[PDB]
Design a binder for this molecule. Structure first.
Ligand SMILES: *[C@@H]1O[C@H](CO)[C@@H](O[C@@H]2O[C@H](CO)[C@@H](O[C@@H]3O[C@H](CO)[C@@H](O)[C@H](O[C@H]4O[C@H](CO)[C@@H](O)[C@H](O)[C@@H]4O)[C@@H]3O)[C@H](O)[C@H]2NC(C)=O)[C@H](O)[C@H]1NC(C)=O
Ligand SMILES: *[C@@H]1O[C@H](CO)[C@@H](O[C@@H]2O[C@H](CO)[C@@H](O[C@@H]3O[C@H](CO)[C@@H](O)[C@H](O)[C@@H]3O)[C@H](O)[C@H]2NC(C)=O)[C@H](O)[C@H]1NC(C)=O
Ligand SMILES: *[C@@H]1O[C@H](CO)[C@@H](O[C@@H]2O[C@H](CO)[C@@H](O[C@@H]3O[C@H](CO)[C@@H](O)[C@H](O)[C@@H]3O)[C@H](O)[C@H]2NC(C)=O)[C@H](O)[C@H]1NC(C)=O
Ligand SMILES: *[C@@H]1O[C@H](CO)[C@@H](O[C@@H]2O[C@H](CO)[C@@H](O)[C@H](O)[C@H]2NC(C)=O)[C@H](O)[C@H]1NC(C)=O
Ligand SMILES: *[C@@H]1O[C@H](CO)[C@@H](O)[C@H](O)[C@H]1NC(C)=O
Ligand SMILES: [Ca+2]
Ligand SMILES: [Ca+2]
Lengths: 639, 88, 640, 88
């Protein structure tokens, strides 16, 4: 048979004989660019991936057809206009070629105030308030949707987004770019339920849709604006010297956005390698396919890694005697630029059919951006697998192993809204992982017309060797999760996450004591969960690995670990990101901390009646997951 | 194109749209850089001479007390706006 | 091994040698009566059931401690007073000995209007409106909570509940009784989450709590009121001749309720017989233990059946070689007279640990009330098991088999709010069964001080043979669900339920086409679910019955059938009865029909934008359950 | 108890509570069946005379223009209420 070392070599052997740069080159040909979601060239690349999966001889290939509402530019030009001296002096700043999807169609006019990146901290550290005025913000740090939401939260009437040259060293100052301002994922006009014909598309509007117009402008347009603005941008921001803060007294900005909705047909292409022991369980490997521009780095690299991962793994099963216990699903989503729409509609549609069957999602999107750092954002259940992978996968340039920081897990950042792996983890309770070889600065040409293969190979000369290591990381992920009778998911990694939450909450024990409350039951839950994980490791130790009945009895308890952290007390339709650790909403553990921090200030920003309910449900959500992991219901303690 | 612009300016003012509003409509319908709203014809001549003198690369057409300016480079467009603010 | 015929006989022999009347007599002794929730006598009976479970030598015995808020009488007397001629004439009607738990503490004064049983239809078919007036209603037909909720919806200021002699043939006309008016289940001050100390009891109020005072009065008090009321009660109602409709011009009724809350400790007592093959799955058998009065019929019979069912099955495992594959849990809840509090807090507390492990709940509450009829309310998944049981279980009196109506399943009514098996099915997605030997009239002494053993054996002389057949029915339920490699759950029974929904919905095809909608995708979902059940039956046919893996692979799909009907789009905290078939809320299939029923009438009661969302989410809930039952996700072919 | 009622009704009226309100307080504080509020003191005895004649099983105590009636059986209590309405 084949052990891990035999499979690691057979994977590493086929990686050296794989040409990745020629595949990325094919996906960037004239027939597949540009491929905005629902376009004809999007359907062309979908049909190519569909045929490629059949030639690889997978177990089965199928497709889903969704009809989602997106937003596109109108025949009427969007404009940014400066008006001076009571509307008697007008100045055309830019007729942008880009736009922000899901912006509100409106024309707002008033003061323009700079707010750095638009984060909540940036709006707090501002001299001028943004009440009733238009806001201009630099791209980065947070998603377009978060910028708009934070400006809306302070009653701003509009948002402008540009790319300064300090953070985005781009020679073309007239370059336009694209984004979306929906504070969520999926089709925002079918929130919480799939975009199938069965629903007959009832009137439903996501609460994440903004209610102010937002427009993107080039750096030249932003420098046109700064010539009409006063105040020096602080040195903390580390931006261009042409930066300014607030328009003059008699000067205003007239933002005109007139985007329109468009019902489009999107295609999700799938391929599956059926398992040999437990085929009803499976891992999912996905990669975004659509892009506003050419999307070589955003979409081309991801799809290329997906195509060759399916070819290599299908070759190993048929030609090298690979026998995975669980199945493997390869997926090429569409409508990813609008906010993981193709992937979210799949989860929202087949949630019942993959409740406790899909146990890991791997996202190959934007896996190659640079060569300096190897960053990863994932669920703690995959931290141990990621650590083991970094210890025997060599850097393309350095040649040393990826594992160089022993405190790497304490520095990991959580998955963000723009990541296609976020809805898998925060909504469906499926452990997810996103990884990339990148630099400390953002890939500047993302979301622009310059995200071509020419610009990608010029910045990364070793693109083939770098794309090979990205496949080796994702390849080792799939093998470790599918070949052995034991799942490489590490449930013990949540003991540090829970202990960090209880310790962080204990720093405000003074506020808790004066409200007549106690953290003693939250400590009890952390300890009850710790002992449940220690008992499960003991049960796995004394387990006869060949006894399939006892093993899947224990494996079914592991695949429930991530699910039992979804909040059982919230509506998945109006609050779909239910994961108390990584989701969004008042039910999350970070939301509990932000509220309690507001009590030491005498103002009534604190709610108390909400906090007491937050502490109650969060305490039992942890205690409930602990009691389910301990074993049977009759094996629980009482005080 | 000057013939087309001046004829579109004729309709907006006859329909009853304000001069300030018509200025914004002109910039969003044609490839014009800066539009100035003037009181009498004296300033309209003052503004038109001043901008042609310092920026001769610009084509300036005017109708009634509203002056339209078409220029193409970011740098020249900058100078026209600064020239119009100075002479207003 | 032991087959079914060997186990059916081994159970039937121990049933004949079991004394049920002596246990019901013991539970009605002076040491365990009365046992209001949280009382000392309630805790005494808990230790008896706990010690009896240890003597039966079960696998494990344990108990849970909850701290729930109930409502009890105040030191201030509740009063019903008639006031005439501008407060200058006062008339004491009654200082009632009963009360309605969770009624609002208030003093209301105004007109009194009769509303028959208080159902929604009764308030619609009424001449006088009840806005700003007190309402008096007969007990029965619907729960106390439904009566109060329907009156509040029409701006009533108070509710009086009495027992007429026609529906309740009681000789004592001054008898008071007890109930609760909470439109829900569980501790109404911890809605959606368990009543443990861990929660630290945050300020939360269930939306089912009423905001009007509710009081129970005796028949004599009601006849005192009717002497000040005009109008003849319709002959349709079939009530007493002393009945009247509306008070006189100058007369008002002053209802004064001042009940207070009380935090109490309740006990849930448990015992388990562990399985031999798949012990992580189990059936649950429960029975309410507390009662306001003696509760012989309400609580005594149920707990007595629970005690002897645990003794017989434990005897069968140790002395007769019974080896059930799955486990059996015996539970004795407390605070049952309130909103099924003891059972609901257990579900709300350990929901994660019994997500796909507990696959059936059997409710023994009020299983003996009469002897004429044998009634059953249950989930369709257990219809086949119930039908198979009725074909070899003899009636206590007639000696004939219980299976006498071949079209019995079409006449079954769904579980009601007052039934302890309702939250198991409508909230946790666990198939449930409630059954009883009863008569066409309600047991009159339920919720009164006359629910004694003496009145129960006097009305039911063959109580031992009746309680034996009730135990035989529940016994055969447990055996069929635990001994064979098949769960005996019939998933095909939902094909008739879906077909009935489509037929009822086809009646409004005119309205559907007129709003630009189509029933074609709901047609596809009904057929896709039928094919999913046929594929699973085929898989069970070709299954190697000895192959333990393929059987539990197929059984895991069966245990998800009931769960996949809980609405995935509703908040379990603010609307816990999520089951689209048997729950409550706008997400249920009847709610879709009730709304669409308001469109054919020209009135603006219809809410289009709500219906379009109802039809959308209900369509996919059915299609999703079909796609999950078909098998793997890649093996779901449809005409999408 | 007649002394206690007559003194407790005296305090309610001395404290400033109206006769109509004091009538309801007596019924929920004492074991009283019917209370009648009359205009003059002549009617107070007339109502008491009428009720003692036709329902002699009743104890009728009166204070000022408020007359208190104590009876125990459902039928007799009914007859007292009907007698007070008749003579009021
Ligand atoms: C979990 O929550 C429940 C409900 O809040 C809580 O139960 C309550 O605990 C308190 C504290 O033990 C109980 O109050 C005591 O009851 C006993 C029994 O009669 C009394 O002897 C106590 O009196 C002492 O304390 C008084 C404080 O003023 C003194 O005045 C007195 O002289 C005595 O020193 C006290 O009344 C309360 O009865 C229960 N509730 C119920 C319904 O029984 C429980 O303690 C919590 N558990 C934990 C671990 O926190
Ligand atoms: C599932 O839903 C989608 C969305 O409604 C359906 O697609 C739509 O189908 C209609 C009718 O075939 C199309 O109408 C046509 O529109 C074109 C627009 O140019 C017009 O010229 C034609 O005269 C006709 O009116 C509509 O365009 C189309 N929408 C999209 C985005 O493709 C689809 O048919 C539904 N599928 C099923 C099986 O019901
Ligand atoms: C602090 O947070 C709590 C939430 O925990 C806020 O309570 C909320 O208050 C509003 C307004 O009173 C409630 O809205 C109500 O909805 C019901 C639904 O039927 C409706 O009947 C009422 O008329 C009202 O509109 C809301 O439900 C309630 N939420 C909860 C969970 O109770 C509270 O307002 C916050 N405090 C501050 C100062 O913001
Ligand atoms: C008809 O039903 C819709 C759907 O429930 C109601 O719309 C809701 O209105 C409330 C209050 O504005 C919102 O909080 C909900 O989000 C709305 N739901 C939707 C789906 O829009 C509407 O109010 C109902 N109309 C009437 C007259 O009852
Ligand atoms: C009940 O409603 C009717 C209709 O408006 C109104 O005339 C009447 O005064 C109301 N009665 C009360 C007691 O509110
Ligand atoms: Ca959707
Ligand atoms: Ca509760």
């Amino acid at each position: 048979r084949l052990y891990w070392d035999d499979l690691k070599r057979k994977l590493s052997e086929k990686l050296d004989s794989t040409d990745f740069t020629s595949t990325i080159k094919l996906l960037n040909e004239n027939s597949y660019v540009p491929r905005e979601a629902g376009s004809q060239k999007d359907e062309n690349l979908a049909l190519y991936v569909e045929n490629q999966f059949r030639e690889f001889k997978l177990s089965k290939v199928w497709r889903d057809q969704h009809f989602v509402k997106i937003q596109v530019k109108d025949s009427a030009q969007n404009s940014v206009i400066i008006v001076d001296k009571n509307g008697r002096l007008v100045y055309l700043v830019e007729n942008p070629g880009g736009y922000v999807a899901y912006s509100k169609a409106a024309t707002v006019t008033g003061k323009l105030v700079h707010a750095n990146f638009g984060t909540k901290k940036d709006f707090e550290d501002l001299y001028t308030p943004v009440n009733g005025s238009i806001v201009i913000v630099r791209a980065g740090k947070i998603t377009f949707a978060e910028k708009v939401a934070n400006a809306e939260s302070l009653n701003a009437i509009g948002v402008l987004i540009y790319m300064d040259q300090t953070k985005f060293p781009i020679v073309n100052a007239e370059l336009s770019f694209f984004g979306h301002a929906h504070l969520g994922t999926g089709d925002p006009y079918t929130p919480g339920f799939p975009s199938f014909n069965h629903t007959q598309f009832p009137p439903s509007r996501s609460s994440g849709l903004p209610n102010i117009p937002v427009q993107t402008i080039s750096r030249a347009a932003a420098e046109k604006l700064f010539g009409n603005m006063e105040g020096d941008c602080p040195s903390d921001w580390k931006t261009d010297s042409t930066c300014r803060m607030v328009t003059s007294e008699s000067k205003n900005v007239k933002l005109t956005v007139s985007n329109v909705l468009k019902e489009i047909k999107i295609l999700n292409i799938f391929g599956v390698i059926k398992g040999f022991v437990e085929p009803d369980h499976y891992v999912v490997v996905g990669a975004q396919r659509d892009a506003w521009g050419p999307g070589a780095a955003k979409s081309g690299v991801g799809t290329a890694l997906l195509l060759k991962l399916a070819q290599m793994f299908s070759d190993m099963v048929l030609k090298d005697g690979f026998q995975p216990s669980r199945s493997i699903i390869f997926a090429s989503w569409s409508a990813g630029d609008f906010g993981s729409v193709g992937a979210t509609e799949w989860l929202e549609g087949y949630l019942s059919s993959l409740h406790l069957k899909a146990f890991t999602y791997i996202n190959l999107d934007k896996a190659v951006l640079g060569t300096s750092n190897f960053k990863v954002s994932a669920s703690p259940l995959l931290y141990t697998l990621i650590e083991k992978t970094m210890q025997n996968v060599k850097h393309p340039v350095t040649g040393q192993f990826l594992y160089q920081d022993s405190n790497w897990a304490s520095k990991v950042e959580k998955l963000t809204l723009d990541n296609a792996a976020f809805p898998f983890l925060a909504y469906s309770g499926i452990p997810a992982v996103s990884f990339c070889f990148c630099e400390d600065t953002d890939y500047p040409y993302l979301g622009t017309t310059m995200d071509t293969y020419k610009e990608l190979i010029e910045r990364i000369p070793e693109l083939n060797k770098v794309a090979r290591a990205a496949a080796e990381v994702a390849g080792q992920f799939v093998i470790k999760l599918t070949h052995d009778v034991e799942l490489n998911l590490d449930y013990e990694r949540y003991n540090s996450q829970l202990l960090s939450f209880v310790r962080d909450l204990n720093q405000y024990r003074a506020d808790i004591k004066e409200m007549g409350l106690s953290l003693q039951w939250l400590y009890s839950a952390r300890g009850d969960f710790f002992r449940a994980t220690s008992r499960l490791t003991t049960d796995f130790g004394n387990a006869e690995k060949t006894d399939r009945f006892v093993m899947k009895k224990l494996n079914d308890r592991v695949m429930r670990v991530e699910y039992h952290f979804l909040s059982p007390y919230v509506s998945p339709k109006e609050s779909p990101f239910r994961h108390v650790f990584w989701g969004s909403g008042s039910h999350t553990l970070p939301a509990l901390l932000e509220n309690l921090k507001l009590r030491k200030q005498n103002n009534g920003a604190f709610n108390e009646t909400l906090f007491r309910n937050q502490l109650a449900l969060a305490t039992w959500t942890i205690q409930g997951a602990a009691n389910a992991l301990s074993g049977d219901v009759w094996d629980i303690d009482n005080e | 194109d000057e013939e087309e612009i001046q004829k579109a300016i004729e309709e907006l003012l006859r329909k009853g749209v304000s001069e300030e509003e018509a200025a914004i409509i002109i910039v969003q319908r044609f490839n014009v850089a800066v539009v100035v709203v003037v009181q009498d014809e004296r300033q309209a001549k003052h503004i038109s001479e001043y901008i042609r003198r310092y920026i001769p690369e610009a084509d300036v057409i005017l109708f009634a007390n509203i002056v339209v300016i078409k220029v193409e480079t970011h740098e020249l467009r900058k100078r026209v706006w600064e020239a119009a603010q100075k002479a207003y």
